[PDB]
Amino acid sequence: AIVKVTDADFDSKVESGVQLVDFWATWCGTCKMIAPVLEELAADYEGKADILKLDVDENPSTAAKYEVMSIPTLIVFKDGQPVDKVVGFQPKENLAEVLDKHL
Known part of the structure; x- marks a missing residue:
């Protein structure tokens, strides 16, 4: 479903089309709350x-x-x-x- 991305392949994966990038961290409670969404x-x-x-x-x-x-x-x-x-x-x-605002 959701693919991980890193400093090494970021420009490779974010180059064409529309992507939504989630900047999160394990210590982030609110981030865990939006994950399922x-x-x-x-x-x-x-x-x-x-x-x-x-x-x-x-x-x-x-x-x-x-x-x-x-x-x-x-x-x-x-x-x-x-x-x-x-x-x-x-x-x-x-x-x-x-998203629909950019598609």
Whole structure:
């Protein structure tokens, strides 16, 4: 469902189309709370968008590159460029809304 991404293959996986990247960490309670919401969302958009996860403790440079200061942070990418951002907890509805705005 949700594919992991790291500093090493980020540019490889985020280059074409629309991707939603979830910047999370194991110590993040709110991040665990949105995880199930993204797994559903991912299904709702198979073939439309890719949902990726990037652990900020193990991949500090990508987090620094996109100014990710607080988590969770979800960033929408389109053809390798960040076009939108969502912070904090968000119900499935609100996330689907942000995606259709870029498809």
